[PDB]
């Protein structure tokens, strides 16, 4: 029997050194990560190779660029396989993502989710260890249009970028609501501005009894509703690569970045659940989600775990030394601002954004044990990111103390209850999933 | 008195050599262009410096990339000042636009509308001749988000790109229609998916009695309607650069690319009219529009001409040798396709798109005469692009014959009548604007 | 509680290897430096990246250029954060300072005080350690005009250089002395040579009842005097960066290079005292001065220490292997000179300059202990640089023996008495400041 352990974690938004402090609880986290066969995280920052140019990314909270020396903080902490597909990997454009891959390869760090072309971004990376091998696939459902990689044609090269999981939303409305929408379209003169497109394309492209108005899809249904669905091409392409990786490694882990919420902020979008189920149907041993910056529930599906969101494992956005002009413009200034003052005014001196809420400063590191591909243990290690501490101290991870760990483990159990997930709890505040195996 | 002549033209979508054929009407066009002090066109193609990667641009009709030798076709034909801000300048990304500027500078071709940063894209270019100087400013209202250039910050460099003229549209709806829109928002569960944004930002960002639903702005009014307005920052920045250029050149020409229609396809958007009036208020001597691929009206405002659209002066999209994989994917294929077959199937063997309509194959070259900044003549030269000819022959310009020129001059007069523009007509089918000077 | 130790030191003018000798007192110094969380020094030499060209710097004692391998001597000795703003950082011009930053970054050495532009030179550097973080800011009040860095404009790049603290001197003279100065100006014909400047600028620029003659500022006062004041822009910009750094690190240290004397050589200029007080008012935890090559007093201000001058920690000017032609020209030669003979004749075989005076060969290394930003200890370690030894042996640091340390500690106490500073003295000749905490 082959026995392999895998640590999982969420967003690694690292911008400073000294990631692991002298706190014994922080050193114990590093010992935990180093003790596993593979430790996975999501690199939610662009290590600067000097190459590239800042992109306009206000919806993502601004640019997230750091000195490349943060990569040594990541590996020294114990992380050894990096997922890179997310809404910040392209913060320095195509040249930036080329520089990131150069930096990662020169340091010997296995990574997936970005590439010089679409195939390269979709490929798994194979991390080989003496005890066995892990294949990591990384994709993101949250990114700016055009940032996805592209494969070459016979005449033109590809385009560097990220591995995409696109998705569409459809608004279910009643026939009465539907008629008003088409009435607004005609009476406002909006339909009159598509008159040329009717001659060009042959018919009004707004008639799909489906309907495209305002860039949104409307569908007549009995009761109002809201549905989301994966892009069939991305879903079937990513699923195909999972089947490929299953033949070439002991363990297949799919990492998926997704900000989009379900009916509630605690809930993943329905398309993300269909995606996660598809990955395990294709042979993946675990699905690790991230994006929201807080924890979501844990689902066991066909005896494999789905972590819909592990939050942040490092959170140092407000310590960024590199703020672009477009980010500075989101804040009205009388005189030029410095990065720290810009982030302090962006939040209203910490009264808004993520600072005042505890859910944004708790994290979780699951440690999974597999024996011949069968999950035999899933230990849960709550992580404290320092809620309420000064801005320069919070965001660095440590194993939470007993009292904080119990509160976090309670939250995870409550978030996981709709999936039927049960948890055993240890005296130290750690826990593990009840497995049907 | 200083006397200066300026030829204007629309989109130059050149992908092949032999731009000026041996046809005497084509050679006469080159003689006309060469005979002026300045000849302006809009470079609607990316000259390939080998650098860059194709971007996803399906809304613009695909990528538009050509051998850099087409630049010698452009200058040999008589064009001497290039506007470069449009929806295709970024078809090879930021590296492509850096390569384009390298190619243009190495050939000594003055250009505006793109730059290594936003200031560089906004700057006028000064074309100095023995008789005097012309300042060209170039901006585009049609481009993919993020393609605009960016200026540096203290910490981060800028971003190469185009000079933008952004604009917003607002839907005027009745209070009854407004209430249904907010009812759809709440009943579909759409408002429930913004619950986290209410805690983060402080309030529902959909409440501006203005309203943002579906990514569109809705405003309660007495009668349904549709309005557009320039981005105040772009308008005031571009206007500022026009005032700067007026102090440094005899003539200031503003070239603006705009696909967006008004109430009718023949009509420019209201924001474009406000922009054009603003440019002349600031000191511009002419405003030349392009984008739609057909002609629009001509307006005289404060004794200066506004050409809302001069159509295409060269139209060789279907002869492109460089089709990207994402463009190929817009066409369903059984076996791999070649560019010519791809463009033939993209249009349904020429039954759709621009091929079957005459308005897409007529053009116009105005020749303006200024004396000490006063417009003293505005001659109109209709151009034939070869409607109905084989795909490899159509798209090259020549002075239209008498019968075709008269039809085109009639169209221009009809399109210009709502502005009060009158035209004198010559025996050869050319004409000129009736000037109040 | 976070507990952090910081070693401070003065000018590091290192040009040779073997910085730490086999002497046990030298090895004990390295053990002391290595034992702290952060050890700061001022790099008073240009590590040669092969780039640059020697500048004319006779006022600073000539060029100070060394093999880049001296950087390994600096870090192996225990120094871990480098201040680089001083009157020698630009000895190889802008290319030299670019090469220095390349050399420092490739070796992983944190540094501040120089940059590719003014912002980069003003920024703090953040040194992160397991126990906490230190922010270092570095500026110089002594440099050749034009050597300060410059920030970019929209049209032009910045200029690499140093972080400046400019300052002006004003001569207070009586009205009788004032009238003679204006009489000399008119009667010598000096005022007649500004006749064109009166037409150009509008008025005589020598009339500010202030007065600018001979490039000096004169002001009428009741009694003759002499005052100095910081450049308000540099003071307010540096103060702003201190407030920024206070939000992002546990400790903020400001290092300021200043040759200028006060009323006495032992005294700092009044502008330097105002600067140091301003830094602590803004949140700095320590101010470390250097420049004079001898010790100055120590001030406690708002329970934070100000070391107006720690002298030299390494002094190997006369061992430089790289003497420029302009430096050689300061010495009259019959035949070409070698560096050692040039430095021996520059001093008159050691009868002039710094060789014969003991104050130039004593140094001091304070070791500060902070607990949550509160200074809880400030130990003083006298350093011996080998006064009276051969030129090739003197300049390397070691902990002074008991007798020499007591003499140095006495000097420091006497220099610090005007500030109210008291010292406790240990049996070994070390000491510490009496803290009001
Ligand atoms: Ca994210
Ligand atoms: Ca276009
Ligand atoms: Ca000095």
Residue numbers in the entry:
A (entry chain A), B (entry chain A), C (entry chain A): 1 to 208, 211 to 439
Question: What did the publication describing this PDB structure actually write?
Answer:
The X-ray crystal structure of MslH:apo, indexed in the I422 space group with one monomer in the asymmetric unit, was solved at 2.30 Å resolution. In contrast, a gel-filtration experiment indicated a molecular weight of 410 kDa, suggesting that the recombinant MslH is an octameric enzyme. Each monomer is composed of a large domain with a grip-like subdomain (G-domain: Ala141-Pro234) and a cover-like subdomain (C-domain: Ser317-Trp363). Two α-helices (α5 and α6) of the G-domain on the monomer protrude toward another dimer-forming monomer, and participate in the dimer formation together with part of the outer surface of the αββα core structure. As a result, α6’ from another monomer, together with the four antiparallel β-sheets on the G-domain and part of the C-domain of the monomer, forms a large cleft on the edge of the αββα architecture in the core structure. The crystal structure analysis of MslH revealed that the subdomains (C- and G-domains) were characteristically involved in interactions with other monomers to form dimers as well as the substrate-binding cleft on each dimer, and the dimers formed an octamer composed of eight monomers. In addition, an architecture that would construct a six-coordination motif, consisting of four amino acid residues Glu44, Asn87, His259, and His261 and two water molecules (w1 and w2), was detected around the C-terminal carboxyl group of MslA Phe20 in the MslH:MslAΔTrp21 crystal structure. This six-coordination motif is conserved in the MslH:apo and MslH:MslA Trp21G structures, although one of the oxygen atoms of the C-terminal carboxyl group of MslA Gly21 occupied the space used by the w1 water molecule in the MslH:MslA Trp21G structure, and is located at the entrance of the central ββ barrel behind the cleft. Thus, the MslH crystal structure suggested that MslH possesses a rearranged structural analogue of the Fe(II)-binding site in YmdB. These rearrangements were also conserved in the MslH:apo and MslH:MslA Trp21G structures.
The lasso peptide MS-271 is a ribosomally synthesized and post-translationally modified peptide (RiPP) consisting of 21 amino acids with D-tryptophan at the C-terminus, and is derived from the precursor peptide MslA. MslH, encoded in the MS-271 biosynthetic gene cluster (msl), catalyzes the epimerization at the Cα center of the MslA C-terminal Trp21, leading to epi-MslA. Herein, based on X-ray crystallographic studies in association with MslA core peptide analogues, we show that MslH is a metallo-dependent peptide epimerase with a calcineurin-like fold. The crystal structure analysis, followed by site-directed mutagenesis, docking simulation, and ICP-MS studies demonstrate that MslH employs acid/base chemistry to facilitate the reversible epimerization of the C-terminal Trp21 of MslA, by utilizing two pairs of His/Asp catalytic residues that are electrostatically tethered to a six-coordination motif with a Ca(II) ion via water molecules.
